[PDB]
Amino acid sequence: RVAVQVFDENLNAKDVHLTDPVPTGRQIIKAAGKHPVDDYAVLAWMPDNALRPLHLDETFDLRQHGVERILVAPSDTLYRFFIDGQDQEWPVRGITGVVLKTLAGVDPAAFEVFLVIPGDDDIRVEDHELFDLARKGVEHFQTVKR
Amino acid sequence: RVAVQVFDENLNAKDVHLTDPVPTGRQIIKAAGKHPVDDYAVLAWMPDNALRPLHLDETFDLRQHGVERILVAPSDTLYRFFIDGQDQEWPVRGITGVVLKTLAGVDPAAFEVFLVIPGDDDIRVEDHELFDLARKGVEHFQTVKR
Amino acid sequence: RVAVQVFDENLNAKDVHLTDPVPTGRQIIKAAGKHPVDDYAVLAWMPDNALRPLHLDETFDLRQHGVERILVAPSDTLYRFFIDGQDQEWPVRGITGVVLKTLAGVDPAAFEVFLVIPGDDDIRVEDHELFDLARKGVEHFQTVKR
Amino acid sequence: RVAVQVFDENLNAKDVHLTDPVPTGRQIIKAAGKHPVDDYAVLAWMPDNALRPLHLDETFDLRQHGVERILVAPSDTLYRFFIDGQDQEWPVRGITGVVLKTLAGVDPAAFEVFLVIPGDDDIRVEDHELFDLARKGVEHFQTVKR
Ligand SMILES: [Ca+2]
Ligand SMILES: [Ca+2]
Ligand SMILES: [Ca+2]
Ligand SMILES: [Ca+2]
Ligand SMILES: [Ca+2]
Ligand SMILES: [Ca+2]
Ligand SMILES: [Ca+2]
Ligand SMILES: [Ca+2]
Ligand SMILES: [Ca+2]
Ligand SMILES: [Ca+2]
CATH class of the missing domain: 3.10.20.90 (Phosphatidylinositol 3-kinase Catalytic Subunit; Chain A, domain 1)
Incomplete structure (x- = not known):
């Protein structure tokens, strides 16, 4: 078994x-x-x-x-996103920041996950903030050291 | 090569x-x-x-x-659907009936693809009809002999 | 004992x-x-x-x-049928809708069992309606929420 | 493999x-x-x-x-029958005598399979005779030495 x-x-x-x-x-x-x-x-x-x-x-x-x-x-659809340069598909529409940092393989407390928007201000996802992946386009998340 | x-x-x-x-x-x-x-x-x-x-x-x-x-x-998201009991993920939002029947491995002309809605009328997707997979829920498509 | x-x-x-x-x-x-x-x-x-x-x-x-x-x-023969995607063999020729919904593991009152015919109108089996399984072909039954 | x-x-x-x-x-x-x-x-x-x-x-x-x-x-239904006292279910409607004797584990040539009807004449199924199992009732087949 x-x-x-x-x-x-x-x-x-x-x-x-x-x-x-x-x-x-x-x-x-x-x-x-x-x-x-x-x-x-x-x-x-x-x-x-x-x-x-x-x-x-x-x-x-x-x-x-x-x-x-x-x-x-x-899930009925898989949303694609990049976390620290790694491609992933999340089955559910919303993802929490702690889950993002766990996927990145980094300490949730010691790191902060940012939706990287080139040319504009990056959006910091909190540890228990349910960021919506339904936003148009592939999401690029990067875990910056806190 | x-x-x-x-x-x-x-x-x-x-x-x-x-x-x-x-x-x-x-x-x-x-x-x-x-x-x-x-x-x-x-x-x-x-x-x-x-x-x-x-x-x-x-x-x-x-x-x-x-x-x-x-x-x-x-594509930014993969939409899940069932064609003849086979699970698939379509990268794009819309799928044509000819593509559905090609995925089913059946003759496009000899077969008609239906979105099966149990208890209600099934929706026949035409050969060049761009059915939208963004509809809530997993789509079950079945190719009935014409 | x-x-x-x-x-x-x-x-x-x-x-x-x-x-x-x-x-x-x-x-x-x-x-x-x-x-x-x-x-x-x-x-x-x-x-x-x-x-x-x-x-x-x-x-x-x-x-x-x-x-x-x-x-x-x-019984002298077992008739095969699918209820909510589960394969079953019924020993007797006729099955009541309440029995179908009990096999589906759903509330008989809160659900309605339908013989699903892709491309055509599904046949609603009543709670005490003795649907005949002797009909040619495997029967696909699905319990839709009432 | x-x-x-x-x-x-x-x-x-x-x-x-x-x-x-x-x-x-x-x-x-x-x-x-x-x-x-x-x-x-x-x-x-x-x-x-x-x-x-x-x-x-x-x-x-x-x-x-x-x-x-x-x-x-x-197959859509399994027909029950007894061969040499062994219970079996045949998926298909018709069974050949050679198949019956193979199931009985006996030499097809050295044995003859009979549908046993108590009180009446038993029906000898030939080696390549497609006996129909759709006949009402459970069929009792016995392989008598030729
Ligand atoms: Ca296995
Ligand atoms: Ca930036
Ligand atoms: Ca997205
Ligand atoms: Ca290589
Ligand atoms: Ca869908
Ligand atoms: Ca015992
Ligand atoms: Ca239908
Ligand atoms: Ca049947
Ligand atoms: Ca006799
Ligand atoms: Ca029989």
Whole structure:
């Protein structure tokens, strides 16, 4: 019985055990106890903090060392954004600054995340400020040392 | 010099040659001659007609048999939808019915694509009708024989 | 003496006690007091509302926590159908809408079950309407919120 | 890469290789190259010649010794019948006598399969005679030595 960490839009971990060593996205969503399956987007959180979308029939090999990270969220569209030069797709419409800094792999307290707008003033997203990713265009976030 | 087929939101193929046998998404976007790189979403079109998103640093192994299929489109968000039970993410806001039926792997003329609304009348998308995927909720498309 | 809930085509529970902790389908049919054994189909009703057929020699482990659910019905053929994307086999030829919504795990009053016909009008099955599953093809039922 | 034998209503084997050690019925149907998934019934052919239905989300552990046997057939209903006292469900409406004797585990040439009708004359099914299982009632087949 392998184990994984199912997250949410707030990056709250939730250990879930699966008998299948190599389950599909549908199996992971079933294990998360979220229904219907078609309404939820699942992304594999790679060790380098990269969110790669996983499809309902795409298998994720859990038969490795360590507990894998999976982010399952109720979503109908994935919004693209850049955090510290890393491309990501967030399933949900709004993202908190603490989540952005966690994705950047930096200390939430020691760093401040800024939406970088070249030529204009950058917008500082607070730790618990739900910045809306629905804004037109790809969002470039950078974590400046506080 | 490997070769790939770069598509668009209209699924118009465009053969592009790359020296790198295993290039990244950034290299593919550069080869497509589309700038800036950050504004374009690239999806690998798998042989089973599955669009899997590819990231700017994720490598795509082109050193295989046959010409691989890549879809590069100017996009800031990926809209999720189901076509014949297959999960897909479309980079662009609008999709034509001919593209939907091509993704379904069926003859565009012999089939008609319907947005299935359980309990209500299904919406028939015409061959050159640009259905908007921005509609709230995941879209379920099914290709009924004409 | 373990206990189980023997159901019927109307999903009417009936507590039955068995001395054998791990009885076979034949033993369960005998405990249900239904003769001859060969004319009755038995399905284990899994906790996730999945009906999995059980054979006369296949053992069902009752030595677990909670009372298990068994559906025993006079049947010569199992008709396949999809309810909310879940595959099921109904032993009897006709199924009531209340049974469909119970299988879907939703409130019978708050939801309405529809036979989904892509491209055509969906057929609303009433709560006590005995829809015939003998219709050619696999039936796709979806419970829309009322 | 594990391997399985995908059969059909004529019990024609077809070796198929799967990367997933423990795939679901949906994965097996995908590997068989049969679409749509919802129209096909899959049954695990147990070593004792027992056909046990497998569901689209039910996992089949292939990580064992020997090549497992899977029967995938286009089916909307499973017809129940007894062959040599063994309960079976045939996905397709018609079954050939050679298939019946193969299920009985006996030599097709050395044995003759009879539909046993108590009190009346038993009906001998020929080797390549497509007996219809749609006949009302459970069919009891017995293989008498020729
Ligand atoms: Ca698996
Ligand atoms: Ca600035
Ligand atoms: Ca955005
Ligand atoms: Ca390279
Ligand atoms: Ca949508
Ligand atoms: Ca026992
Ligand atoms: Ca409809
Ligand atoms: Ca039917
Ligand atoms: Ca006789
Ligand atoms: Ca029959």
